[PDB]
Every structure is written in structure tokens, then in C-alpha cells.
Amino acid sequence: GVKTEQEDVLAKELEDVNKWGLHVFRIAELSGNRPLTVIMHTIFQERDLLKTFKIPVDTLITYLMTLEDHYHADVAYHNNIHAADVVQSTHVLLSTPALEAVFTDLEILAAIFASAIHDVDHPGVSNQFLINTNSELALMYNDSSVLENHHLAVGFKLLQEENCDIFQNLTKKQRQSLRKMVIDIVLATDMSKHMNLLADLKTMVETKKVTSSGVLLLDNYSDRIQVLQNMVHCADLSNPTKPLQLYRQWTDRIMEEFFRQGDRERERGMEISPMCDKHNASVEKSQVGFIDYIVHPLWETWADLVHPDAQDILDTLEDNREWYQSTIP
Ligand SMILES: COc1ccc(C2=NN(C3CCN(c4ncnc5ccsc45)CC3)C(=O)[C@@H]3CC=CC[C@H]23)cc1OCc1ccccc1C(F)(F)F
Ligand SMILES: [Mg+2]
Numbered sequence: 001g002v003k004t005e006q007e008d009v010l011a012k013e014l015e016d017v018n019k020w021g022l023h024v025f026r027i028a029e030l031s032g033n034r035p036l037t038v039i040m041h042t043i044f045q046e047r048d049l050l051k052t053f054k055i056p057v058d059t060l061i062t063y064l065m066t067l068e069d070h071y072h073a074d075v076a077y078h079n080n081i082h083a084a085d086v087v088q089s090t091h092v093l094l095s096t097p098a099l100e101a102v103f104t105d106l107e108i109l110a111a112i113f114a115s116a117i118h119d120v121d122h123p124g125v126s127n128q129f130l131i132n133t134n135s136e137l138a139l140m141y142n143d144s145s146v147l148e149n150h151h152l153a154v155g156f157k158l159l160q161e162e163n164c165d166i167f168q169n170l171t172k173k174q175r176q177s178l179r180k181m182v183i184d185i186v187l188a189t190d191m192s193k194h195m196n197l198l199a200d201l202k203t204m205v206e207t208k209k210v211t212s213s214g215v216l217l218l219d220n221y222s223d224r225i226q227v228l229q230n231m232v233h234c235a236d237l238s239n240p241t242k243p244l245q246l247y248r249q250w251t252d253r254i255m256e257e258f259f260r261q262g263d264r265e266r267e268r269g270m271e272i273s274p275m276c277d278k279h280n281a282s283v284e285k286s287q288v289g290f291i292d293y294i295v296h297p298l299w300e301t302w303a304d305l306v307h308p309d310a311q312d313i314l315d316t317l318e319d320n321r322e323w324y325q326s327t328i329p
């Protein structure tokens with residue numbers, strides 16, 4: 001009933017779970033390609049979610065293993081490691097001092113569950129790609145948030161596999177509220193929603209109320225869900241905010257995925273997509289664009305809402321942006 005030596009080293013990595021900059025690829029290697037399972041397990045135990053929601057531990061492991069196996073290992077970015085990372089980033093964001101004791105256990109379970117399933121069974125190409133290829137997924141979801149609808153359907157459907165229903169002891173009220181929050185969160189990970197989500201976050205910062213302590217006041221669902229959506233969306237676009245060793249790996253894998261869509265976009269004759277090719281499109285410019293137009297406006301707006309808990313993260317993101325700028329000839 002003692003850990004193997006591999007399991008111990010993994011245990012000591014997982015002492016960083018509450019920390020921005022977790023060694024997630026290392027965890028991925030130490031866990032035998034189980035970052036999503038071991039990180040989800042670790043956060044569930046730490047947040048006491050098995051007791052609160054009467055989740056049998058064998059059902060949690062079976063589901064988590066089933067979930068991770070429905071991420072594609074042959075897709076370089078949108079895989080189980082990105083899922084683990086977004087889970088752990090949402091986890092750290094939930095612990096932010098400015099949100100202390102704001103969210104119910106169900107809101108927390110929804111945020112973490114949403115983060116774990118949000119890219120499941122991602123085929124390694126984009127909505128526009130799936131739409132333009134006339135892919136079954138684009139026809140199933142009448143071309144609207146094709147991937148995000150799919151992730152949700154698979155994430156929920158896998159609860160129906162043998163000993164996989166992690167919510168089997170929740171009441172119908174709990175399950176109805178959890179399912180609605182998880183849908184609203186994952187649908188908000190579609191980048192075509194980003195402009196609007198950010199507008200609602202800007203509006204919310206101008207209106208920003210607070211309790212007797214420094215913690216935000218969110219007295220309606222519209223506001224509570226908006227913060228959980230923007231929190232997981234922040235998690236999803238958090239790569240450029242990590243130490244550069246991490247950030248650089250995420251970039252390699254996104255380019256590989258995008259180049260690989262490019263390669264596929266040549267034989268299909270579709271005409272290259274966004275900065276997805278060497279025969280032009282510079283990686284370093286692309287990262288500066290991404291940071292200047294998407295990642296910084298969002299993270300800057302988040303940082304104001306939780307001022308000043310997000311200062312270090314915003315600093316790292318400004319540094320990483322200067323780094324990428326200095327690499328341009
Ligand atoms: C580690 O680095 C990245 C991580 C995730 C993403 C993701 N990007 N997107 C993008 C965001 C908006 N898009 C744009 N298309 C053309 N011109 C522009 C100019 C400014 S954004 C933008 C197209 C889609 C996604 O939808 C992904 C799925 C979910 C969330 C985030 C993911 C992008 C990373 O690197 C940047 C990038 C890489 C490769 C090509 C282009 C870009 C680029 F900078 F341009 F974005
Ligand atoms: Mg996604």
C-alpha cells in the first residue's frame with residue numbers, strides 16, 4: 001500500500017498543482033500519459049469533491065481514464081495534456097483571493113468538469129476546416145460551434161459507459177444546474193464568442209461591486225456564469241502567460257497542428273487558412289498578434305476584475321510578448 005518510485009516522483013510534481021507554471025509535460029511523462037486523470041484526481045481530493053458529491057473513487061478513476069482515452073494522442077496540441085493544463089489553470093484561477101468563498105461546490109465542479117471535457121475527441125483541425133470539408137461533425141451541428149458541441153456531447157455520453165457515471169448520486173436539480181453550467185462554459189470556449197465574452201467582462205469591471213471583504217459580488221446567474229465562462233476561456237488562452245519553457249512547447253504543438261491542417265488544406269486545394277504555413281506566415285509575428293489582439297486584452301481585463309491577484313501572470317505575459325518581439329528580423 002506504498003507508492004512505486006515512479007508514482008512518488010509523480011506525487012512530488014503534483015505538490016505544484018496549486019501553482020501557475022506546473023510541470024504538466026513532466027507529469028504527462030511520469031503518469032504514463034495520464035496528466036488529465038492524475039491532475040483531475042488530485043484536484044477532486046484536494047477540493048473534497050468526492051465526499052461533497054458522493055462520487056465513488058473507482059467510478060471517478062474509470063470515467064477519467066475513459067475521458068483521457070477519448071483525447072487523440074496523434075494530435076499535437078488539442079490532446080489530454082492541454083485538457084490537464086486547462087483543468088489545472090481553471091483550478092488555480094478558482095483559488096484567486098478576489099473570488100474566495102464566492103462560488104458554490106457545484107459551480108466549482110462545473111468549472112473543473114467543463115475544463116476536463118472542453119476539447120475531448122478534438123480531431124486536430126478547426127470549425128472552418130470541418131465546415132468547408134463537409135465533415136459529419138459540421139453537418140450534425142448545422143455548422144455552429146461544431147467542435148464545442150461535439151466535446152460536450154462526448155464528455156456527457158461517456159458518463160453512460162460501465163461504472164463511468166460520476167454524478168450518479170447528484171439530485172435531478174443538481175444535475176440539471178451542473179449540465180447547464182457545463183454547456184454554457186464549453187460553448188464559450190469557441191473563439192468566435194471571444195469578442196462578446198470580453199465585452200461582457202469589460203462591462204462587468206466598470207460595474208464591479210464587492211462585499212465587506214475584497215471578494216467580488218455576483219448576485220445573479222448571468223454574472224456568475226459570465227465569470228466562470230471567462231475564467232475557463234482565460235485557462236484555455238493561458239499558454240502565453242506560463243513560463244517560456246512551457247509557452248514555447250504549446251507554440252510548437254499549435255504550429256504542428258496548424259501546419260498539419262495546412263498540409264491537409266493543400267491536397268484539398270481549399271487555399272491555406274490563418275498563418276498556417278512556412279512558405280510565408282512567421283511563427284513569432286503570429287504569437288505577437290495573438291498576444292496583442294486576444295490574450296492581452298482578455299488577461300488585462302481579468303487582472304482588473306481580480307486586481308491585484310493576477311499581476312505576476314500579466315507580467316509574465318508582457319515579458320513573453322517582448323521575448324517573441326525581439327526574435328523578429
Ligand atoms: C500557443 O499558442 C496558441 C495557442 C492556442 C491558439 C488558439 N488559437 N485560435 C485562434 C485565435 C484567433 N485566430 C486568428 N486567426 C487569424 N489571425 C489572427 C490574429 C490574431 S488572432 C488570429 C484563429 C483561431 C483558436 O481558435 C484555438 C482554439 C481555442 C482557443 C485558442 C486556440 C493559438 C496560439 O497561437 C496563436 C496562433 C497560432 C497559430 C496560428 C495563428 C495564431 C494566431 F495568433 F493568429 F491566433
Ligand atoms: Mg476548444
Ligand SMILES: [Zn+2]
Pocket residue numbers: 082086118119189236
Ligand atoms: Zn482548448
